[PDB]
Design a binder for this molecule. Structure first.
Ligand SMILES: COc1ccc(NC(=O)Nc2ccncc2)cc1
Length: 281
């Protein structure tokens, strides 16, 4: 049981040690498409690349590349697209991916500016009457409504394919209170946020996979998926305590490198799952 494993690692302060064991056990697959010179300006960080086998392909003949990975958790019947915060030149690619994959939700776990630097392009409209057109991908995006709470904002967006005049409603879930350094003290507001995404139907198999991002799409994004999948598996299994976070994390790392960036994010993931288990038992 993970609650006892938590106290052990915590009392022994062995978080950096377990984290290193995970780093060394993690899969390594080719990422040849990401490293092509023509894709250099489509990557925010040169050391964060999608594996070729799990990368999302854009349906454009010219260049199909986006820094995005499909995480498929077979036992949990959950699938997530993890991607980097879009760049100024990839905002149109981002919304093309949302369109092509039939996603219903976008989950954003960063602020546009953190530590005085831009972590992400402003890829959604700030006002109802000022819609955005992505000329490169032939899409129009309109803010329909915005509901600002203390810890997160939910926005309803309309995405229109200008080529076919189909429209879809997209839900933007923006967690706004992750601190510049370290992790939240308590996982309560993060769990509340995760349950709000679930309640929307954005994580449901009727829809394409949810798009999850932070700046690189590996750290905070990793914590989001890890907590969701672990809590799901605890509902599904005859023995909820057979769920080993470490094993679940290593499975996800077959699909995208580097998920959970720090020993602090690992500790926070344990705490989120342990605490979330009380609201589920
Ligand atoms: C000398 O380099 C090494 C660094 C780390 C490990 N693994 C390790 O400490 N695992 C561990 C698991 C649970 N509690 C405490 C520790 C082995 C060798």
């Amino acid at each position: 049981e993970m609650e006892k494993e938590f106290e052990q690692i915590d009392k022994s302060g062995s978080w950096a040690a377990i984290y290193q064991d995970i780093r060394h056990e993690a899969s390594d697959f080719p990422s040849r498409v990401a490293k092509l010179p023509k894709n250099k300006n489509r990557n925010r960080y040169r050391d964060v690349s999608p594996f070729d086998h799990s990368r999302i392909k854009l349906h454009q003949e010219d260049n199909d590349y986006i820094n995005a990975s499909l995480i498929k958790m077979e036992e949990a019947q959950r699938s997530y697209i993890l991607t980097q915060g879009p760049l100024p030149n990839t905002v149109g690619h981002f919304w093309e991916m949302v369109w092509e994959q039939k996603s219903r939700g976008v989950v954003m776990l960063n602020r546009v500016m953190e530590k005085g630097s831009l972590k992400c392009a402003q890829y959604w409209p700030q006002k109802e009457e000022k819609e955005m057109i992505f000329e490169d991908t032939n899409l129009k995006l309109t803010l329909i409504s915005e509901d600002i709470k203390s810890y997160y904002t939910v926005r309803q967006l309309e995405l229109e394919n200008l080529t076919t005049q189909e429209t879809r409603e997209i839900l933007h879930f923006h967690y706004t209170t992750w601190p510049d350094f370290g992790v939240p003290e308590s996982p309560a507001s993060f769990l509340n946020f995760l349950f709000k995404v679930r309640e929307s139907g954005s994580l449901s198999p009727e829809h394409g996979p949810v798009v999850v991002h932070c700046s690189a799409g590996i750290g905070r994004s990793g914590t989001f998926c890890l907590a969701d999948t672990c809590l799901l598996l605890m509902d599904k299994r005859k023995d909820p305590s057979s769920v080993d976070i470490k094993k679940v994390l290593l499975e996800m790392r077959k699909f995208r490198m580097g998920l959970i960036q720090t020993a602090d994010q690992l500790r926070f993931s344990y705490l989120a799952v342990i605490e979330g288990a009380k609201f589920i038992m």
